[PDB]
């Protein structure tokens, strides 16, 4: 049961670990949100081959 | 013969230099092949943030 707890307490800190990637939000990406208002991904063509 | 020859040559050189500077000037090029409201455009741009980003 001790070990149970070790690992059981590991599992909850991932766990958080993950809401919390969840719960940040990063800077918008304005760049591909402007190429889409002209409806193509200006980005993903010129790029390609 | 040789010296006329070569008075030729940079009258030739001279036309062309003409000829290239007006060209120049004139750049020459082919022809091109809605506005946006910042609001809808923002809310998009972070919505793409969490797919965009790694």
């Known amino acids: 049961g001790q070990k149970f707890c070790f690992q059981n307490l590991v599992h909850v800190l991932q766990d958080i670990r993950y809401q919390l990637s969840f719960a940040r939000l990063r800077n918008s990406d ?14 993903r063509l010129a790029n390609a081959p | 013969i040789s010296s006329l ?8 050189l001279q036309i062309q230099d003409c000829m290239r500077e007006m060209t120049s000037i004139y750049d020459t090029h082919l022809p091109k092949t809605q506005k946006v409201n910042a609001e809808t455009l923002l809310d998009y741009g972070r919505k793409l943030s969490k797919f965009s980003s790694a």
Request: aromatic share 0%; proline share 0%.
């Open chain 2, 5 to 12: 020859l070569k008075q030729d040559k940079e009258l030739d």
């Open chain 1, 30 to 43: 304005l760049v591909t949100a402007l190429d889409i208002l002209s409806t193509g991904t200006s980005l």
